[PDB]
């Protein structure tokens, strides 16, 4: 609580608010705060990168919208809006006792929402979407005002066990549609059961035409990760990007094109393609060439209990931002194990062959443990009568749930909430 | 307005 005298002097017309870091009250002002009037120090910018788009299980932000910290926050009443403001921020920039006034005000609107921008010395910036845009670092979409937001429409190619849908749910993003291409019966099954019939399954991605894309109604989000076997370089039998299942990449490339808005249509649109980092060099280049972008590399280890390094091409907001670990996450294989079993390593390795000690004997990971490694809710793939082999394979191919949670989170600022 | 308490970090 170190800025009270500085802000006092700010309203005393002796210090410029733009000359102070309104987050921590540092004098080391370098940037301007993208959302409000004032300066920002670099450390708070780092924090802002890790924290801004972190949301709790209630679907509200984990921390204050201003300081990206704060001990007690006020959640926002307006529909589809998820912001919070710590009591402490408010009891400075707005006025003293303004916080309890919002606490007691049953229908309350946050300052990102309220019609006018003055709320004390605190004022909302008019160009803030673009500043936000730059902060996280070309056609770029501004964030949709809270009342206009609608349910997201999703095309998901090579959907696997429907990780996409799961994460969007966990984030509490309202989902209008979720069309998914898949051909593996076990995975389709998992999806069907787990999301209660909601997924429109089409078959082979190669049966999806532009006409289909058009009549399956506008999409807000296209996602997918093609098979990696013929791409992965450690495979002696590789057929490469242009053969085997490698060429399925190009189907993504096709359908993305088909699903994309025409120039002049500025509706928000997002896409995410994933694959293994262990590919050829010309392969990775040709993918980058075709999606006209370069991948970000993300390793699950940062946030899960597996060494899983993956490339992600796409235009999701802030996907370059640093990966943070929410407390829910389970780092260390031990956190993922069943009682009486003990972890050799701290991270499992999938892109000792028996990672577990159980009563002097050397055991493999149990499907439920593997689920836990991968960030999935436990028993998520307990659905049909498919072999243990099959359930392993399914979990083997999938996205790390907390990595995807990280990628999808800022979509909340563009779509509707439950 | 509704109120919650944050989860402390690191």
């Amino acid at each position: 609580e170190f800025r009270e005298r500085l802000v006092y002097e700010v309203r005393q017309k002796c210090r410029n608010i733009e000359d102070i870091c309104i987050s921590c009250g540092s004098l080391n002002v370098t940037l301007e705060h993208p959302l409000f009037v004032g300066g920002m120090c670099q450390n708070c910018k780092n924090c802002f990168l890790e924290c801004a788009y972190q949301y709790d299980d209630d679907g509200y932000q984990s921390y204050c919208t201003i300081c990206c910290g704060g001990r007690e926050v006020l959640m926002c009443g307006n529909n589809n809006c998820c912001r919070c403001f710590c009591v402490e921020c408010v009891d400075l920039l707005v006025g003293p006792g303004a916080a309890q006034a919002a606490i007691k005000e049953d229908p309350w609107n946050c300052y990102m929402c309220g019609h006018k921008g003055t709320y004390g010395l605190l004022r909302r910036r008019e160009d803030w979407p673009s500043r936000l845009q730059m902060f996280f670092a070309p056609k770029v979409y501004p964030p949709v005002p809270a009342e206009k937001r609608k349910p997201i429409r999703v095309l998901s190619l090579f959907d696997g066990i429907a990780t996409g849908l799961l994460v969007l749910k966990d984030l509490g993003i309202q989902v209008d549609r979720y069309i998914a291409s898949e051909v593996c019966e076990d995975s389709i099954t998992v999806g069907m059961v787990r999301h209660q019939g909601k997924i429109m399954y089409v078959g082979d991605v190669r049966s999806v035409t532009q006409k289909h894309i058009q009549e399956w109604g506008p999409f807000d989000l296209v996602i997918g990760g093609s098979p990696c076997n013929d791409l992965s370089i450690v495979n002696p039998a590789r057929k490469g990007l242009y053969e085997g299942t490698g060429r399925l990449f190009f189907e993504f490339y096709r359908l993305l094109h088909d699903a994309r808005p025409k120039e002049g249509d500025d509706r928000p649109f997002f896409w995410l393609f994933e694959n293994v980092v262990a590919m050829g060099v010309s392969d990775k280049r040709d993918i980058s060439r075709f999606l006209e972008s370069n991948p970000v590399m993300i390793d699950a280890k940062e946030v899960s209990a597996a060494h899983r390094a993956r490339y992600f091409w796409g235009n999701l907001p802030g996907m370059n931002r640093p990966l943070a670990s929410t407390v829910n996450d389970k780092l260390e294989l031990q956190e993922c194990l069943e009682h009486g079993r003990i972890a050799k390593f701290s991270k499992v390795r999938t892109i000792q062959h028996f990672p577990v000690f159980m009563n002097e004997k050397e055991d493999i990971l149990w499907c439920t443990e593997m689920e836990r490694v991968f960030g999935f809710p436990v028993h998520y793939t307990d659905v049909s009568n498919m072999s243990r082999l099959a359930r392993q394979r399914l979990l083997g191919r999938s996205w790390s749930v907390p990595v995807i949670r990280h990628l999808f989170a800022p979509l909340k600022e563009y779509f509707a909430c439950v | 307005a509704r109120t919650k308490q944050t989860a402390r970090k690191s």
Partner: protein, 191 residues
């Protein structure tokens, strides 16, 4: 026929992006390119590997985009699909922004190098079935240029072409020369 016919004095010289094969020759033969030897109106690229959309944009407007698989035998540094995908990719870069009513044509030609799975892929990616045009006794054509079917001929079952392929000896191919004819509706004649 999808475009309005241009009055003749208003017509302008065709601009062509020519991707693996080169049609400079037979396109000068028909009078589309001026016999005066410029680089001028036609670009020929070969290793598009590092061709970016900006490149295609700076090599000026294109009214025709052409691509083909290298004829049997000699020059397949890259696998036959690569030609189709790379073609497709650059094609979209050359496409007119919407809504420009300007006439825009493209053609991709297999010199009988694509197998059945590759053929299916081309047809799905180019959103049509190919026309097969034969010798006497050998080429496949995907295009938005009208009236390729302007003159009918022999059936030529896929088995035929298969054996025709098999021979592959003594180790091409402007059987496609006439197809560019309707382009005269929109573009300047020379000589």
């Amino acid at each position: 026929f999808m475009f309005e016919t241009v009055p003749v004095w208003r017509r302008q010289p065709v601009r062509v992006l020519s991707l693996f094969e080169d049609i400079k020759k037979e396109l000068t033969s028909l009078g589309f390119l001026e016999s005066g030897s410029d680089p001028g109106q036609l670009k020929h690229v070969v290793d598009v590997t590092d061709t970016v959309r900006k490149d295609v944009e700076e090599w000026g407007p294109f009214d025709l985009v052409y691509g083909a698989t290298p004829p049997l035998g000699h020059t397949c540094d890259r696998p036959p699909s690569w030609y189709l995908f790379q073609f497709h990719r650059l094609l979209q870069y050359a496409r007119p922004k919407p809504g420009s009513p300007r006439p825009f044509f493209w053609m991709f030609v297999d010199n009988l190098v694509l197998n059945k799975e590759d053929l299916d892929v081309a047809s799905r990616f180019l959103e049509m079935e190919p026309v097969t045009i034969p010798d006497v006794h050998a080429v496949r054509v995907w295009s938005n240029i009208p009236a390729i079917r302007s003159r009918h001929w022999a059936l030529v079952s896929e088995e035929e072409l298969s054996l025709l392929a098999q021979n592959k000896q003594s180790s091409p191919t402007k059987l496609v020369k006439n197809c560019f004819l309707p382009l005269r509706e929109y573009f300047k004649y020379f000589s």
